[PDB]
Structure 1
Amino acid sequence: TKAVCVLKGDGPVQGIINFEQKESNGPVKVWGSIKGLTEGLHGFHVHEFGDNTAGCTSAGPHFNPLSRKHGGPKDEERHVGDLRNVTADKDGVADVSIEDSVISLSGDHCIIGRTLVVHEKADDLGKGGNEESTKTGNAGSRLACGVIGIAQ
């Protein structure tokens, strides 16, 4: 399977992110770039709904089919949608090259038809000592998003 997402938002933030899974239960490669970002770390998650009728707001919460706590490290408790942080350079460009073992593009709990979101602030990966850390990672507002679609 291959998938793709066009990220867009109100601001200068935009990008394209590609997904590829060679085998049914194989790792998913996630790669592309996002620009218009402030230099530094930006939270990066799959959200539950592929509903962009009210912008990124209508995407709902982090995609969490197992009803677990927010995280990031793929070897510890997380939402399925938790993809940690992207890092923007001095020119505001975040080149993305990730391999994730928890998301999938087929079978149970796949992310096709859901929304990819890039955030205002860094994701604390559920490591903070506050309630918000366990829910959102304190990544703040949604800067750009798009629906994840099947690609050729």
Structure 2
Amino acid sequence: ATKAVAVLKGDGPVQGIINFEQKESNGPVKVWGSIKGLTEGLHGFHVHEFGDNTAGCTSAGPHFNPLSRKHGGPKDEERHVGDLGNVTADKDGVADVSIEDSVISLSGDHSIIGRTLVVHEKADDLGKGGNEESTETGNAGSRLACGVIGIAQ
């Protein structure tokens, strides 16, 4: 598709809306929106594999990683397709998202449509942490809110 949307819900006060836009298949996807209820600071922002939220966010699985790479920042080469990095929430706990990614897409093999967008408790270290977790989850912590990425108009 060329436009997708995800409504982030969770158990806590964390909630938000993230829009995805892709002008043309080969093109980079613009991810933009707002999330409220976050502690100020950095928070992991990733696209997990399954858009299954039967057990809330835990059922979403691990990072969408079809090229079986290790975890890293969104500008890194070795990285999961879903590693979108961190989003910063201000003093009022609001994160006005604005990422532009070229690895994820809204069509094809790397299509995130049907998968789960997840916002994390802590910062993602982008794989520069030094331990096994770093190159697997980036040590981002628990999943505060998540939502299935769907086709929008």
Q: 2:74–2:101: 8 Å Cα contact kept in structure 1? A: no
Distance verdict in 2 for CA 1:73–1:146, change over 3 Å: closer
Offset at 1:3?
0.2
Please list every run of 5 or more consecutive structure 1 residues that lacks an aligned counterpart in the other structure. none
* Structure 2 residues not aligned, in runs of 5+: none
Whole-Å Cα distance in 1 between the matches of residues 150 and 74 of structure 2?
A: 25
User: What do the CA deviations read for 1:60-85 (whole angstroms, capped 9, x no partner)?
Assistant: 00000011100113342100000000
Residue of structure 1 equivalent to 2:139? 138
Aligned-CA RMSD value: 0.7
CA distance in 2, matches of 1:71, 1:110: 19
Moved more, 67-76 or 4-13: 67-76
Q: Is the 8 A contact 1:74 1:101 kept in 2?
A: no
- Partner residue of 2:120? 119
Bigger mean CA offset, 70-79 vs 24-33 = 70-79
Give the C-alpha shift of residue 94 in structure 1. 0.4
Q: TM-score, normalised by structure 1?
A: 0.98
- Give the 4+ runs in structure 1 shifted more than 6 A: none
Is the 8 Å Cα contact of residues 74 and 102 (structure 1) preserved in structure 2?
Answer: no
Could you tell which deviates more after superposition, 67-76 or 133-142? 67-76
State whether residues 57 and 146 of structure 2, in contact with CA within 8 Å, keep that contact through their aligned partners in structure 1: yes
Give the TM-score normalised by structure 2: 0.98
C-alpha contact (below 8 Å) 2:18/2:31 kept by paired residues: yes
Aligned residues: 152
Asked if the contact 1:20/1:29 (under 8 Å) is kept, the reply is yes
SS in structure 2 opposite 1:33? strand
Counterpart of 2:64? 63
* Equivalent position SS for 2:50: coil
CA distance in 2, matches of 1:73, 1:28: 12
Q: Deviations over 1:13-70 (max 9, x none)?
A: 0000000000111000000010000010000000000000000000000000011100
